Design a protein around this motif. Structure first.
Motif, PDB file in Angstrom:
ATOM      1  N   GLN A 573       1.982   6.654   2.845  1.00  0.00           N
ATOM      2  CA  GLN A 573       2.070   5.536   3.338  1.00  0.00           C
ATOM      3  C   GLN A 573       1.195   4.445   3.093  1.00  0.00           C
ATOM      4  O   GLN A 573       1.453   3.279   2.452  1.00  0.00           O
ATOM      5  CB  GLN A 573       2.434   5.593   4.991  1.00  0.00           C
ATOM      6  N   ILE A 576       0.256   1.806  -0.372  1.00  0.00           N
ATOM      7  CA  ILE A 576       0.687   0.536  -0.781  1.00  0.00           C
ATOM      8  C   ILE A 576      -0.551  -0.463  -0.673  1.00  0.00           C
ATOM      9  O   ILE A 576      -0.441  -1.456  -1.265  1.00  0.00           O
ATOM     10  CB  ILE A 576       1.941   0.019   0.021  1.00  0.00           C
ATOM     11  N   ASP A 577      -1.290  -0.199   0.525  1.00  0.00           N
ATOM     12  CA  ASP A 577      -2.304  -1.059   0.464  1.00  0.00           C
ATOM     13  C   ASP A 577      -3.673  -0.758  -0.327  1.00  0.00           C
ATOM     14  O   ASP A 577      -4.991  -1.087   0.289  1.00  0.00           O
ATOM     15  CB  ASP A 577      -2.726  -1.099   2.038  1.00  0.00           C
ATOM     16  N   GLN A 582      -9.776   2.414  -7.520  1.00  0.00           N
ATOM     17  CA  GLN A 582     -10.235   3.051  -6.506  1.00  0.00           C
ATOM     18  C   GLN A 582      -9.592   4.449  -6.424  1.00  0.00           C
ATOM     19  O   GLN A 582      -8.333   4.444  -5.813  1.00  0.00           O
ATOM     20  CB  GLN A 582      -9.787   2.245  -4.924  1.00  0.00           C
TER      21      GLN A 582
ATOM     22  N   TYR C   1      -0.372 -10.489   3.144  1.00  0.00           N
ATOM     23  CA  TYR C   1      -1.299 -11.045   4.518  1.00  0.00           C
ATOM     24  C   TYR C   1      -1.381 -12.269   4.633  1.00  0.00           C
ATOM     25  O   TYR C   1      -1.268 -12.703   5.883  1.00  0.00           O
ATOM     26  CB  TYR C   1      -2.583 -10.207   4.220  1.00  0.00           C
ATOM     27  N   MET C  38       6.495  -5.994   2.081  1.00  0.00           N
ATOM     28  CA  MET C  38       6.275  -5.054   3.267  1.00  0.00           C
ATOM     29  C   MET C  38       4.931  -5.070   3.879  1.00  0.00           C
ATOM     30  O   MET C  38       4.103  -4.598   3.267  1.00  0.00           O
ATOM     31  CB  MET C  38       6.824  -3.781   2.916  1.00  0.00           C
ATOM     32  N   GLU C  40       2.452  -3.217   5.982  1.00  0.00           N
ATOM     33  CA  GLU C  40       2.490  -1.767   6.812  1.00  0.00           C
ATOM     34  C   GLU C  40       1.924  -2.193   8.153  1.00  0.00           C
ATOM     35  O   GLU C  40       2.263  -1.398   9.260  1.00  0.00           O
ATOM     36  CB  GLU C  40       1.773  -1.022   6.024  1.00  0.00           C
ATOM     37  N   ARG C  42      -1.702  -3.376   8.748  1.00  0.00           N
ATOM     38  CA  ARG C  42      -2.992  -3.551   8.391  1.00  0.00           C
ATOM     39  C   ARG C  42      -3.708  -4.407   7.455  1.00  0.00           C
ATOM     40  O   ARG C  42      -2.823  -4.694   6.546  1.00  0.00           O
ATOM     41  CB  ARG C  42      -3.852  -2.095   8.096  1.00  0.00           C
ATOM     42  N   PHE C  44      -6.487  -5.119   4.613  1.00  0.00           N
ATOM     43  CA  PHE C  44      -7.587  -4.802   3.903  1.00  0.00           C
ATOM     44  C   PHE C  44      -8.473  -5.813   3.276  1.00  0.00           C
ATOM     45  O   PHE C  44      -7.863  -6.909   2.759  1.00  0.00           O
ATOM     46  CB  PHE C  44      -7.168  -3.628   3.048  1.00  0.00           C
ATOM     47  N   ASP C  48     -12.383  -1.585   1.091  1.00  0.00           N
ATOM     48  CA  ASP C  48     -11.481  -0.421   2.039  1.00  0.00           C
ATOM     49  C   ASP C  48     -12.075  -0.550   3.493  1.00  0.00           C
ATOM     50  O   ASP C  48     -12.163   0.404   4.246  1.00  0.00           O
ATOM     51  CB  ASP C  48     -12.025   0.853   1.490  1.00  0.00           C
TER      52      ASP C  48
END
Lengths: 599, 615, 61
Positions: A573, A576-577, A582, C1, C38, C40, C42, C44, C48
């Motif tokens: 999940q 996506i972010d 990385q 965001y 979408m 989620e 959070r 970022f 990280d």
């Protein structure tokens, strides 16, 4: 730390260094020393000596390997094997594994009776063409019976083995009978007397009523149920007297109940249980059922029904001199109290024989009649349909077998996908080299396999599969295996949602990329093969590198990279972010972790 | 909603679900201890079940000797346990049994036991659960105390060169008369050595299914061990010919005996008669068995045989007629707030009796007479789980009784008896004479101390009885004696523990206490237990253990992963039909020849003898 | 965001029922232009390390 003792010269002569990789190994020593010794140490050739010394054990192993395993069967009780008796036969089960003896006759009897049951059941799909469909099935069914490829139109006659199905199928052939009967699984026979049919009614719930038939005269019969003989006389819908010869607790109860139903003795033939009112359905899907078979079925559901039936039969207190020949509710050989008109004894009642052959007449419901009614067999006295693998058989006429299941459907879909390759233009490799993947989303075979897909969330599956397909085609790095695996899903409009890592069909099964599964599996060093439930399939082509590049068949917008423990573990999940450059670790299966990088 | 996990007993049997009633087999976490109070209560109940009050001061200790045999008194309330034995009835039952089986029966059995003993090496005594050292004054395996005894004999009066059971026994005898004895260093006198040899300690271990009533299981020394072994050998040779003797073995043979008995009954009893069953459970089978009656019985047995056996069999009995019992840890004291706590041994509790509570006091004064330093001169009873064969023989003698008073009424009995559990089958033709027969049987049993419980002994009609956890019924004989191994407690070797467990599971399957699926589950469980014990795992697994680092490093040099050993990142290949076959024999032809020869290299610094042993 | 941040801000500002400890947290994302996608849950950064709007974490508590 070093509890294990050792020798010293034996150690140095082998040059065993301590703390090889921070493992001491040691006079004393650790256990890891044994691993270091058996993985990197001296080499001998003493196999023959070991075998000779342990000859008894290795001969036992040989004998074991010298077995031809056979089937097993659940049942009861009415030296070289002692080494294995534990695994050969218990008390509820037993396996007929053999060593040297072979004789294939009784297995052939079981096969023929099973297939006869099967076919006679298959003929119970219409209301008018019963005999016709039956006989045509027979004529369209051949078998490699034993060693001879014979047909099923002469075995039924050449054979001599009484059974409801044998008789029910042979009467249509105008074949000879043996005056035997079949009321359910029980086996009956007439001894003396005779009568005529008579009708009566029986209530259900206390309001309705249904008609049944019986006989009014006196007539004696010979019952015979598994591990149990008997003799009795029926008179006017009631059982007068009865005697049982061979004793088994369970068998004596069921045999007595069946003979009672055959005599229709008891009050449940006046009224009915409150359980029947739950249904009151003395009928099939579209057919009628008598009261006797309904009662029987009600017995098969639970032994409490059997106990109730037996209580319906009068129970009394046994008198002296009769305990030895009394009975109990649970078949007990002797008891202070027994049931009315009963007699137990030892030794099976010798069964008589009838040397007079006849032929009967089949009815719409296939019920055979010899004379004065006296039904001899029917489908009602058969078990429910039981699927069993049939071999050495040929069945050509329709209704032979459905032979249609989701598993087989998927197998055929994948076979078609594989054959489509065809090493030619307008096929998988040409579109690959051409980089025309959109056409792949329109083939016919995927359209045929589409119905097998889970409908609720097929859009997301199609989205992911198209992603993988395009990403593997455009770049030119791909693997035919995973492609073909996911293709069946690239046939519906792509949509947004949450994906987990598995693609589910409609039969609750699934498939997953980058991994193997029973439905679909493959491996390198055998890439020309594709397993499907263990069924190895072949590839019409050959490849040595077209599959070696799977860096894009695991995830959608990522690519495998060199292992790195520093990279953090993640899920499907949060992907996506993530960003670029990385690295991330992630499970690709059971205890299988791999590193990935975007793009 | 509510729950009741017994409603499944209504529309079903009990022989199919009874197993769910008891927990799974294993070591009891109860920690059944052997305290002083429990031991004293035991001794009290022992002296009390003796319904007499006679005594006779001895000459070797100057101590009374409660002689509870052939001196019955206190007849009142005799339904409760008794220990006063009658010799006449005992010998009569023995004579009945002899007549039934045959005349030269006991003679043949004793001769067989003798010849078996002759070729026996004293080293056999090393095979025992545990014992009690008479030098260190502790409990240990047999081998340790045996080495201690032999080296003490060496240190004091030279070595023992017999290398046989008989010379060992005669050496013990001679040692009974030695005045001074040495051991690593210190020595002792005659009386102290005698006592030590006649000492006993209460062990807390009680591991089995059913009931762990063995709180204070005995733990004798080594002097009496061989004579007990001899007597047990004889009693065993006897119990084999007896149909109603389920002690020496169980399972298949046990079911055979059951069904043989039942069928013989059904074919014997007349039509008019009707049978019954009783689920007997003898209570206090250890606090009512007297070695004096055993001595008289052995004498009557060997009456016609070599005097050698006559004297030999008469050793362990007398050794048990005089047996000092080691009282457990002494009591402790404490102030009100419990800030201070004193600890005292047993020998000095007679010095502070004025302080202990009443229940602990009234249980101590009447016995102070029999105390010497810290032990109690118990002149009888039988606490050890010994002479079980002999007790079973006595029970069978009880069952083989028959007279004319019964015949006149057309009644009799029969059954089967384990050590302290039995099953009776009465026969009669009336719902009352059955009661008379039961009372007659109970009387004949009580005449010789064999009692019966009332809160744990029931009955029913012929079809349903229970014996040694084998709940018999009209059919579906169900067992409950499912055993299992234990690696942590017994780490014999890496190589031999899995094969032993496989053999055990095979056996359990033979006795029908296990089924195929159950056996497979148990196998997959024992494999994991083994691995976790020796801290080993397969190669597919991503473990980082000490053996595992080197095993993971050396995995890439081989291809026959199937042939690998479980001890070395291996995988299973055995199954139900391959239990008698060790995994080694099953992987020999499959192990990469390199690894194979690297394992079976007798030129190494150390069941198929592997290079996997833990000396 | 950025979209989400601006959304929250307007919702808090238009009425008056706001928590100053959330704007100071989400503002740094409102500089760019909204888009579609979408969310989620959070937010970022490039290192990280994230912050979540409503629950305290190691980065903002």
């Amino acid at each position: 730390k070093f509890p294990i003792i050792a020798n010293k010269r034996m150690l140095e002569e082998a040059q065993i260094p301590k703390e090889h990789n921070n493992v001491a190994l040691w006079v004393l020593a650790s256990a890891s020393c044994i691993n270091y010794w058996n993985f990197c140490g001296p080499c001998v050739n003493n196999s023959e000596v070991i075998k000779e010394v342990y000859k008894s054990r290795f001969g036992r192993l040989e004998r074991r390997k010298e077995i031809m395993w056979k089937e097993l069967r659940f049942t009861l009780v009415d030296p070289e094997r002692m080494e294995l008796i534990h695994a050969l036969g218990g008390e509820t089960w037993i396996q007929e594994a053999n060593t040297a003896g072979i004789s294939n006759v009784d297995q052939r009897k079981n096969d023929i009776r099973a297939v006869c049951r099967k076919v006679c059941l298959a003929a119970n799909a219409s209301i008018m063409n019963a005999k016709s469909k039956l006989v045509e099935y027979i004529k369209s069914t051949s078998m490699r019976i034993g060693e001879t490829e014979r047909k099923l139109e002469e075995l039924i006659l050449e054979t001599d083995d009484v059974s409801p199905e044998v008789t029910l199928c042979k009467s249509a052939l105008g074949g000879q009978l043996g005056k035997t009967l079949s009321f359910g699984p029980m086996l009956l026979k007439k001894i003396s007397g005779s009568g005529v049919k008579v009708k009566d009614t029986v209530y259900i719930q206390g309001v309705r009523a249904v008609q049944f038939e019986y006989w009014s005269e006196q007539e004696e019969f010979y019952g015979e149920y598994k591990s149990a003989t008997a003799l009795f006389s029926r008179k006017e819908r009631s059982l007068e007297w009865i005697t049982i010869g061979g004793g088994i607790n369970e068998d004596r109860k069921r045999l007595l109940a069946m003979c009672m139903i055959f005599c229709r003795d008891g009050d449940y033939f006046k009224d009915a249980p409150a359980t029947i009112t739950m249904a009151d359905l003395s009928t099939k899907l579209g057919r009628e059922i008598p009261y006797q078979y309904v009662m029987m079925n009600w017995i098969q559901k639970s032994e409490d029904n059997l106990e109730a039936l037996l209580y319906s039969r009068g129970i009394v207190e046994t008198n002296p001199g009769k305990m030895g020949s009394s009975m109990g509710i649970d078949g007990s050989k002797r008891a202070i109290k027994s049931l009315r008109a009963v007699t137990i004894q030892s030794g099976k009642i010798d069964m008589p024989e009838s040397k007079e052959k006849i032929h009967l007449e089949l009815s719409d419901n296939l019920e055979a009649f010899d004379s004065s009614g006296r039904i001899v067999a029917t489908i009602l006295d058969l078990p429910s349909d039981k699927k069993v693998t049939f071999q050495d058989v040929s069945f050509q006429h329709p209704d032979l077998a459905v032979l249609r299941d989701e598993k087989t459907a998927i197998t055929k879909g994948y076979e078609a996908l594989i054959k489509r390759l065809g090493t030619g233009d307008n096929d998988i490799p040409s579109l690959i080299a051409k980089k025309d993947y959109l056409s792949l989303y329109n083939l016919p075979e995927v359209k045929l396999m589409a119905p097998l897909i889970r409908p609720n969330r097929k859009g997301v599956y199609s989205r992911v599969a198209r992603k993988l397909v395009s990403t593997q085609v455009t770049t030119g790095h791909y693997s035919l295996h995973e492609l073909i695996k996911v293709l069946p899903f690239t046939y519906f409009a792509p949509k947004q949602g949450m994906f987990e890592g598995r693609l589910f069909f409609s039969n609750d099964s699934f498939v997953e990329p980058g991994v193997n599964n029973n439905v679909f599996s493959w491996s390198k060093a055998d890439s020309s093969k594709i397993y499907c439930h263990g069924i190895a399939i072949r590839v019409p082509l050959v490849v040595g590198d077209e599959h070696m590049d799977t860096s894009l068949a695991l995830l959608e917008g990522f690519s495998v990279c060199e292992n790195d423990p520093r990279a953090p573990m993640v899920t499907r999940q949060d992907l996506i972010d993530v960003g670029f450059g990385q690295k991330v670790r992630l499970f690709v299966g059971q205890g299988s972790v791999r590193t990935f990088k975007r793009t | 909603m509510e729950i009741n996990p017994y409603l499944m007993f209504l529309n079903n049997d009990v022989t199919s679900l009874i197993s769910t009633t008891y927990p799974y087999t294993g070591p009891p976490p109860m920690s059944h201890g052997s305290s002083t109070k429990y031991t004293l209560e035991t001794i009290k109940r022992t002296y009390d079940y003796s319904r007499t009050s006679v005594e006779k001061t001895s000459k070797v200790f100057n101590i009374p000797r409660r002689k509870f045999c052939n001196c019955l008194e206190d007849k009142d309330e005799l339904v409760k346990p008794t220990g006063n034995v009658d010799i006449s009835s005992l010998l009569g039952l023995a004579e009945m049994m002899e007549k039934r089986m045959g005349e030269g029966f006991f003679k043949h059995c004793v001769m067989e036991a003798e010849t078996e003993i002759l070729k026996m090496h004293f080293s056999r005594l090393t095979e025992g659960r545990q014992t009690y050292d008479w030098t260190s004054e502790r409990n240990m395996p047999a081998a340790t105390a045996l080495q201690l005894t032999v080296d003490a004999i060496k240190e004091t009066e030279g070595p023992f060169k017999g290398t046989t059971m008989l010379e060992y026994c005669n050496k013990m005898i001679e040692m009974l008369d030695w005045k001074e004895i040495k051991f690593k260093i210190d020595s002792i006198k005659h009386d102290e050595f005698l006592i030590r040899a006649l000492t006993i300690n209460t062990m807390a271990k009680d591991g089995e299914r059913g009931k762990l009533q063995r709180r204070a299981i005995a733990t004798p020394g080594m002097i009496v061990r061989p004579f007990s072994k001899i007597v047990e050998t004889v009693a065993q040779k006897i119990c084999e010919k007896l149909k109603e003797s389920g002690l020496p073995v169980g399972g298949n043979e046990k079911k055979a005996k059951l069904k043989t008995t039942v069928t013989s009954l059904n074919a014997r009893m007349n039509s008019d008669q009707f049978a019954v069953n009783i689920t007997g459970d003898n209570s206090k089978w250890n606090e009512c068995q007297q070695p004096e009656a055993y001595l008289a019985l052995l004498a009557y047995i060997t009456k016609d045989s070599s005097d050698l056996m006559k004297d030999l069999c008469s050793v362990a009995p007398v050794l048990f007629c005089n047996k000092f019992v080691k009282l457990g840890q002494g009591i402790r004291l404490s102030n009100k707030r419990k800030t201070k706590e004193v600890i005292i041994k047993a020998e000095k509790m007679g010095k502070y009796k004025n302080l202990m509570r009443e229940e602990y006091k009234n249980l101590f004064e009447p016995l102070e007479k029999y105390i010497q330093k810290d032990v109690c001169f118990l002149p009888g009873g039988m606490l050890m789980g010994m002479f079980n064969m002999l007790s079973t023989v006595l029970g069978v003698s009880t069952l083989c009784y028959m007279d004319e008073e019964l015949k006149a009424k057309g009644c009799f009995w029969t059954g089967l008896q384990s050590s302290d559990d039995f099953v009776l089958f009465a026969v009669a033709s009336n719902w009352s004479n059955i009661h008379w027969t039961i009372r007659r049987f109970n009387a004949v049993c009580k005449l010789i101390g064999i009692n019966m419980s009332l809160e744990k002994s029931y009955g029913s009609l012929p079809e349903l009885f229970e014996f040694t956890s084998m709940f018999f019924d009209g059919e579906f004989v169900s067992n409950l004696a499912m055993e299992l191994p234990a690696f942590t407690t017994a780490g014999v070797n890496e190589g031999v523990d899995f094969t032993a467990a496989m053999s055990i599971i095979k056996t359990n399957m033979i006795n029908n206490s296990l089924s195929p699926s159950t056996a497979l589950m148990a196998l997959r469980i024992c494999l994991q237990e083994f691995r976790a014990t020796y801290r080993v795992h397969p190669w597919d697994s991503r473990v980082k253990g000490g053996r595992m680092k080197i095993i993971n490093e050396f995995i890439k040099t081989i291809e026959n992963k199937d042939g690998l050993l479980i001890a070395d990142g291996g995988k299973l290949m055995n199954n139900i039909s391959t239990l008698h076959i060790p995994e080694e024999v099953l992987k020999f032809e499959k192990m990469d020849e390199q690894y194979r020869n690297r394992v079976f290299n007798p030129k190494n610094p150390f069941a198929v003898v592997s290079t996997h042993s833990f000396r």
